[PDB]
Structures are given as structure tokens and as C-alpha cells.
A paper describes a structure:
Certain monkeys have modified their TRIM5 genes by swapping the virus binding B30.2 domain with a cyclophilin A domain inserted into the TRIM5 locus by retrotransposition. This leads to expression of a TRIMCyp protein with antiviral activity against viruses, such as HIV-1, that recruit cyclophilins. Using a structure/function approach we can show the molecular details of how adaptive changes in the TRIMCyp sequence switch specificity between members of different primate lentiviral lineages.
In order to understand the structural basis for these restriction specificities we solved the crystal structure of the Mafa TRIMCyp2 Cyp domain in complex with the HIV-1 capsid N terminal domain (NTD). There are two amino acid differences between the Cyp domain of Mafa TRIMCyp and the genomic CypA sequence, R69H and E143K. Mafa TRIMCyp thus maintains binding to HIV-1 despite the R69H mutation because it conserves the closed loop conformation observed in wild type CypA. The E143K mutation is located in a helix outside of the active site at the opposite end of the Cyp domain to R69H. The Mafa complexed structure shows that the change from a negatively charged glutamate to a positively charged lysine at 143 causes a knock on effect through the molecule which impacts on the stereochemistry of the active site. Mutation to lysine at position 143 causes changes to the backbone of a neighbouring active-site loop around P58 by attracting the peptide oxygen and flipping it from its orientation in the wild-type CypA structure. This propagates changes to other Cyp active-site residues, including R148 that is coordinated by the P58 peptide oxygen in the wild-type structure. The altered position of P58 releases the side chain of R148, allowing it to interact with capsid residues downstream of residue A88. The E143K mutation also modifies the surface electrostatics leading to a significant increase in the positive charge of the active site.
Numbering used by the authors:
A (entry chain A): 401 to 546
B (entry chain B): 2 to 164
Amino acid sequence: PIVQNLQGQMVHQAISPRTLNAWVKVVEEKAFSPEVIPMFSALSEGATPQDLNTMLNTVGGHQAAMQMLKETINEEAAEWDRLHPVHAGPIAPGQMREPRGSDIAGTTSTLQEQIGWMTHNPPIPVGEIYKRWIILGLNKIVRMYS
Amino acid sequence: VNPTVFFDIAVDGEPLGRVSFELFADKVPKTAENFRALSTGEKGFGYKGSCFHRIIPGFMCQGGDFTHHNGTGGKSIYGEKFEDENFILKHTGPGILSMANAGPNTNGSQFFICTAKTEWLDGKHVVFGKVKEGMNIVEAMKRFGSRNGKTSKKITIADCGQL
């Protein structure tokens, strides 16, 4: 997540492998009972898209479910692109490209671009937007399994 | 072999002056031809009367959206957006003419004129010409822009054509 250091300074902080273990566990104890969703929200506060993927990439097996989730992410990334057409022309000094769906999902964006969008004024909250897509996929899995 | 095109630039209707361009048809013929034809109006549409909708003073002046006038539009002479022809030529300094685009292989009618060295645009935007006469005019145009690109007056191509 994005966090602060002891001198008051904005720093990205890698995901606590303790939050990670709690999560993975949850998904393996509860399979995909309704309680995984609040858990995921609880555990992913302030997450960058990179952190979110680290979370998902750790889920051991549950291949079919993870695939449902990926399909949902992909559909949402395509919708985002459809609703946010790119303006023509070269990116101006001290600005970033407007994120594409795949940027939001972490696949074509760096940590540092993620942080730039998130901490910009006004921000594009790429971690919150990706988190919403993931929770929709989680909802789909929970509807299937319980 | 390379054609020359002129723009007569105006500021809220008033004449500022003429910019001429060499178009590198010997390296990027499809891209050169697109701009040339949009400059003469020979397809029945093109740059005459259009504006420079996005000017960022220490970077570039952008134009050629003759359909929406705000960067969302543009239309090539080919009936579709066209491929990045090549990235042979580089963004080497002020006066370089290059395609704006909205992603790889999406060239329409928008273009930009560099007002600085923009080497990092190399391989993302197709360079296809350079200012021949009238750099002073481009340097005057850059005064009407801002950070972020909104123009403080309407900068238009009052006339254009092939020399």
C-alpha cells in the first residue's frame, strides 16, 4: 500500500506477507463462503493494483474459481476502455497517460505509474477501481459455490 | 520530390503569418500524402478553418481535428485510421512535424509541431515533416497555450495549401 514514513513522507509499502497469509487461508478455510468478501475488503485497504495481484496470485489451487474471477476482471477492464476513450496526441510534460483497463488491473502499468494516478490531485483511484472489479468477481464465485 | 505545404495562421481571425513545411514523402509517403491532401482540401475536407486546440508552450502545438475541434475527432484520407508507417525519423528539435494519434496504428488527421527536443516521443509518434519557413510564427503561437494545453485565443489555419 501507499503509506507514510517516520519523517512524514509518502512511501509505497510492500504488502505484508501477514495480511497475505490471512487472506490465502480465508479463501482455503471458507472455500468461497460469503465471508471472503468483507475479508478481502478488510485486508486490501490502500492496496495498489500490484498489491492486489500479489494477493490473488497467492491463492493455491481453486483454479476454476480463480478463472471465473479473471474473466470478470477482463470484462470490467474492457468496459472501462469502452467508456474512457483515449484523447489524441503526445503526453504532456508532468502528466501521465490516462489509464487503460489493463493499467488498472496492473498488467501494463508499473507500480510507479499506479502510485502517480492514486496520489494525483485530482486522483484516479486505480486501486479502488480494481478492488471493485475483484469484489464483483468474488461475488460471482460466492454465488456459484454457496 | 518532397512536397511543401503552407498554413496561414490567424489569431481570433487576425493574420499572424505563414508557416511552410517540407513533407518527407521520400521516407513516409503515406503519412506525407495524408497531410498534403488535407492541406489542399482536394478530398473535399481538411485543415482549412481548423484550429490548434492544444498548445503547451515548452513542448508542442497540436491541431488537425477538423471534425470535432477538440482532440476527439480526426479523419484520414484513407477511409480509416492508418498504420504507423515507420519510425525512421526522430524528434530532433523545434519545428518537427509529427502525427498525434490515439495509440499505435491509429493515425487520422491530428498532428503536432514540436517547440522543443522531444526525443522520448521517438517510436510512439510518426515524424513526417519539418517547418521550412515561419519558425518565428510557431514561436509566436506557443504564447497562446498553457500547461495542460488550453489556448487563450482561437488559433486557426485561416488558409492552407501546397506550394
